[PDB]
Design an enzyme around this catalytic site. Structure first.
Site, short mmCIF file in Angstrom:
data_model
loop_
_atom_site.label_atom_id
_atom_site.label_comp_id
_atom_site.label_asym_id
_atom_site.label_seq_id
_atom_site.Cartn_x
_atom_site.Cartn_y
_atom_site.Cartn_z
CD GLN A 198 24.78 101.81 -11.91
OE1 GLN A 198 23.87 101.17 -11.38
NE2 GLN A 198 26.06 101.54 -11.71
CG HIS A 231 31.41 90.74 -6.63
ND1 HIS A 231 31.36 92.04 -6.18
CD2 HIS A 231 30.46 90.06 -5.94
CE1 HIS A 231 30.43 92.14 -5.25
NE2 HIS A 231 29.87 90.95 -5.08
CG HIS A 235 26.84 88.34 -8.79
ND1 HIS A 235 26.94 89.06 -7.61
CD2 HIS A 235 25.74 88.82 -9.42
CE1 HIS A 235 25.95 89.92 -7.53
NE2 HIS A 235 25.20 89.79 -8.61
CG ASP A 266 27.75 92.45 -1.73
OD1 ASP A 266 28.48 92.10 -2.70
OD2 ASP A 266 26.60 91.99 -1.58
CG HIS A 290 29.61 88.03 -0.54
ND1 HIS A 290 30.82 88.22 -1.17
CD2 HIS A 290 28.74 88.87 -1.14
CE1 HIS A 290 30.68 89.13 -2.11
NE2 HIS A 290 29.43 89.54 -2.12
CG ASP A 291 27.88 87.47 -4.35
OD1 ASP A 291 26.67 87.22 -4.14
OD2 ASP A 291 28.34 88.64 -4.40
C1 LIG Z 1 24.55 93.65 -8.23
C2 LIG Z 1 23.28 94.22 -7.52
C3 LIG Z 1 22.51 93.09 -6.82
C4 LIG Z 1 23.66 95.36 -6.53
N1 LIG Z 1 24.41 96.43 -7.20
C5 LIG Z 1 25.73 96.70 -6.82
O1 LIG Z 1 26.27 96.05 -5.94
N2 LIG Z 1 26.39 97.72 -7.51
C6 LIG Z 1 27.79 98.00 -7.11
C7 LIG Z 1 25.81 98.49 -8.52
O2 LIG Z 1 26.35 99.40 -9.15
C8 LIG Z 1 24.41 98.18 -8.91
N3 LIG Z 1 23.54 98.77 -9.90
C9 LIG Z 1 22.38 98.10 -9.79
N4 LIG Z 1 22.38 97.13 -8.85
C10 LIG Z 1 23.73 97.22 -8.28
MG LIG Z 2 28.71 90.48 -3.70
MG LIG Z 3 25.40 88.51 -3.25
#
Ligand SMILES: CC(C)Cn1c(=O)n(C)c(=O)c2nc[nH]c21
Ligand SMILES: [Mg+2]
Ligand SMILES: [Mg+2]
Ligand SMILES: CC(C)Cn1c(=O)n(C)c(=O)c2nc[nH]c21
Ligand SMILES: [Mg+2]
Ligand SMILES: [Mg+2]
Lengths: 364, 381
Positions: free
Chosen positions: A314, A83, A79, A263, A147-148
């Site tokens: 994933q 990003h 973050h 996002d 946003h972050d």
């Molecule tokens: C970072 C998380 C809150 C959301 N998030 C995300 O945006 N991406 C692209 C991922 O691959 C991912 N894998 C688990 N959480 C994920």
């Molecule tokens: Mg983001």
């Molecule tokens: Mg966020």
């Protein structure tokens, strides 16, 4: 120097014109000036969009604020400003490039943008930039950039669980998301040299701020299925009716779903990029895991580096979050793609839809 | 000792007896306390927590309880309306509304030294009881943990109120409005502030005997109640409430549904927060006075800031009658009706369970605050 700067602009725009924009390469090219990537990309896009002129935005204040906003992004594995830049590029691309069969009612008095780096091949195409007023799309681009803002590299759940001051401050509701929007808007009002929206009447500005907040707060995953449900009820219901871009509410929803998709675009990019981002997310999760450990708490799911489940994580993420979102967005026919033959009674090819499918397989 | 303990009991029985009435004379108590009047909230809270049994149910230590609630009072600014006295009034209302007998209310639910976390506790007011089986009280359908959250929320729902409306704060771009992105600015501040206060010092921790689960839920319930007091969402809560309770295709309530239970609790503080025009004329006017005075104090600052004076807030052009008339018509009015239609309002049956007057669910009921509302309305039309 004049030509040298123009070459850099054309260079970037060419790079960014690909959905699989090699953002990490840019980070390298900038070298020591890497920390100004978000502001540089914002400037480049606001030019390519024409927003700077449409809203008489003074170049100085603009760069002043975004150069500042960038520094707000901590040096954490995921973050961070890179990003944010990525999420920005995504919303820009998603609302700019040609969308097969998209009916453009408001086809560009309210102003509408139009990217100087692309155009619809013919009447068989369309783009959001033609159905959503420039004010609204600018709110989206800005929201994406902030946003972050000031992310601690921890989840709302963690903050809420540990009764973090920030969580107590927001009553455990969208803790981080609230803080991002509030911190960024506060920064903006901090100094007059940031005020780059000075040429907007109190009416426009009031709305712009609203739109930006709505966009940022929509990025709270705890509300993911509610947006999705709401979006489908309007867009993908044979008993309902398309969208009605003449409706503020409907348009807002489209924008929210759009930033939500941007996002979490990770698994919808080429494998090369997808893995690089995944690596970042997990490294950040593992840091949160090491803390929960140090606090003597149960380590959250997928956050224990000693007992990882990268693939399960994933696979699960794509199945329950990005996947359903992408389908809804695709079903509403808002995804940029291209037709296959010479004839939506025709086959289209959605590059990001394809990437998502292929990536899902590598995690199965 | 005994001569000191027997006198403390008398005060208790007095206060309880006085509060045992919908038109509880709060201001008389304010005077009876005189200089110690600054502790109305903490004294009433303690009193009500004994009348309900909450102190025993959750083994709440008296010291920390008083400590926290004493500090909570002090947080209420000395302004014309949104002060510790208003808080105390709202607290009394939710307590009354969820305890006194309700005609024809279903009793579907649970009607030593260790806390049994396996069993769901329910409170019962010692100051009253259902006349007969024709009556039911809310405290029998909503678990103790949930009512305790409602009461505690009432006690903190306006903590540190600046005497200004949300709109004002949003318009003047107050630092607080920016902080909460213009969403329930005040209400958010009340909850976040009271909670921050609670966690401030260990001597405030009077909920130290709730397990993590129970606490987590309590906190969530409190926040939900406090945030429902934002009038901007007034019609939304009303709508949703009608959808469940009483509409064309209304379903009912199902007290077994946590969501429905919360909705009822929210509609309760909602009503208790604006009980003004539903009390006796005496009380109604006294409250009306505080509100307008505050509204005017705002209009003054709006002027010193060079801003258009907000409707009804200009003392050099008051429209009190118009104000109350509208309020009782578009806000408190429809709310009480809706809440009444759901049959959740205390009251009493008019006749015997034989109302078949051939010489002309089915029997007649008389709701006290329902009439007070019709009466007060008159003196504004
Ligand atoms: C970072 C998380 C809150 C959301 N998030 C995300 O945006 N991406 C692209 C991922 O691959 C991912 N894998 C688990 N959480 C994920
Ligand atoms: Mg983001
Ligand atoms: Mg966020
Ligand atoms: C205080 C205000 C925000 C709401 N409010 C209220 O609670 N009561 C009891 C009134 O009579 C009233 N009249 C106008 N606004 C009112
Ligand atoms: Mg209030
Ligand atoms: Mg109140």
């Amino acid at each position: 120097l004049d030509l040298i700067l123009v070459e850099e602009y054309d260079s970037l725009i060419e790079k960014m014109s690909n959905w699989n924009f090699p953002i990490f390469e840019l980070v390298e090219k900038m070298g020591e000036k890497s920390g100004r990537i978000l502001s540089q990309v914002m400037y480049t896009l606001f030019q390519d969009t024409g927003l700077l002129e449409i809203f008489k935005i003074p170049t100085q204040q603009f760069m002043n604020y975004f150069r500042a906003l960038e520094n707000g992004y901590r040096d954490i594995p995921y973050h961070n400003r890179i990003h944010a830049t990525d999420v920005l590029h995504a919303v820009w691309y998603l609302t700019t490039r040609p969308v097969p069969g998209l009916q453009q009612i408001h086809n560009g008095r309210i102003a509408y943008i139009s990217s100087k780096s692309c155009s619809n091949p013919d009447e068989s195409y369309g783009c959001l930039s033609s159905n959503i007023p420039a004010l609204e799309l600018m709110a989206l681009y800005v929201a994406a950039a902030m946003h972050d803002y000031d992310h601690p590299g921890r989840t709302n759940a963690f903050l809420v669980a540990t009764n973090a001051p920030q969580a107590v401050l927001y009553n455990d509701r969208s803790v981080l998301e609230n803080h991002h929007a509030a911190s960024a808007w506060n920064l903006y009002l901090s100094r007059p040299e940031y005020n780059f929206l000075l040429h907007l009447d109190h009416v426009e500005f009031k709305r712009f701020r609203f739109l930006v907040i709505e966009a940022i707060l929509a990025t709270d995953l705890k509300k993911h299925f509610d947006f999705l449900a709401e979006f489908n009820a309007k867009a993908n219901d044979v008993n309902s009716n398309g969208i009605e871009w003449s409706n503020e509410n409907d348009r807002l929803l489209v924008c929210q779903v759009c930033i939500k998709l941007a996002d979490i675009n990770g698994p919808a990019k080429v494998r090369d990029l997808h893995l690089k981002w995944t690596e970042g997310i997990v490294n950040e999760f593992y840091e949160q895991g090491d803390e929960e450990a140090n606090l003597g708490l149960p380590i959250s799911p997928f956050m224990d580096r000693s007992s990882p489940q990268l693939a399960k994580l994933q696979e699960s993420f794509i199945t329950h979050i990005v996947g359903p979102l992408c389908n809804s967005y695709d079903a509403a026919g808002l995804l940029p793609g291209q037709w296959l033959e010479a004839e939506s009674r025709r086959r289209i090819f959605c590059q990001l839809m394809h990437h998502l499918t292929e990536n899902h397989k590598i995690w199965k």
